[PDB]
Amino acid sequence: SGERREIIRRALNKKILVPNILELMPAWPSEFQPNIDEVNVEIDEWLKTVNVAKEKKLKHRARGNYTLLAGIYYPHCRKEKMLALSQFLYWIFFWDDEIDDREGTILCCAETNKCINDCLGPEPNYTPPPGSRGTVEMLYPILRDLRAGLSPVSTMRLKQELHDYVNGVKNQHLPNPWDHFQMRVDDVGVIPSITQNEYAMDFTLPDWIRRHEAMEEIVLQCTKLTILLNEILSLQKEFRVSQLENLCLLFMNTYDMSIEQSIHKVLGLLKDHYKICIEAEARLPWSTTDEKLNNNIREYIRGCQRLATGTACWSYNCERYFKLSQLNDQQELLLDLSR
């Protein structure tokens, strides 16, 4: 706790100007699905049905605005796609929020895994068991709808990915910053969103391509990029509740560096990972002849990239992490670690 106390003292009241993160990934553009407002209306009507407290749901909706995040993740999807994707994001955020006792966690995760199995499994049952908790009950219709837009191959991937995320959650002095990063890479719930691009754009990437070293690398780099940008962006929010296991903070503690230096390091890491990810593209098994196949490969990688850029763009466009007034019109964010 000496470590934590020192971290708090060093961080506290510091204001750091952060450059536009999107600039760090110049090749990858940020776009918005045209129907976000209309879909939001559907989502608002849908939210009333969901068994989570009205104030919590509104807080998520006003601060989070997950339909917008989905619109950013999948800007080119047909409008009909938007509802299920928006709904899933609401589920994942609600679910994470409710789970945050230990027994409660084991029970919810088991119930959640069961739902994932019932919905995405070989013998599909979309009916929630009676008395399902709200975060569980809501999931069944969403998985059924997503499955409807997915091939069995895409469905299998989604199922494993959802299991992996739920299990990671169940299985969660200061940790080494590198150790923290790796846990997040294994732990993070981004992958289901990448697979969801297949739903959004109604296509299936072949497993042989998905398992290719270059594709596996692009998925990994994009996962790393999303985590790294999240670390900086969420720093103010996390520090304020004294959640000191944030990578910027860990670098301060581990290397005895200033908060400014640690953020700079993370920014450099982003550039490094962006560069690796871009380099990986040449290595992909592009078809000499197949336009549809190459289109599928292109779409799939764009989905991964959007996970990184979109997460940052959405962060710059909602109030989950900081007051928007903290952002200038060059998209430069002034973090304030006043607590």
Ligand SMILES: CC(C)=CCC/C(C)=C/CC/C(C)=C/COP(=O)(O)OP(=O)(O)O
């Ligand atoms: C975990 C979660 C809700 C994932 C939803 C899907 C997803 C991968 C969204 C983008 C990445 C992200 C915001 C991760 C959360 O980081 P964090 O766990 O440090 O939480 P923070 O958003 O408060 O920083």
Ligand SMILES: [Mg+2]
């Ligand atoms: Mg975070």
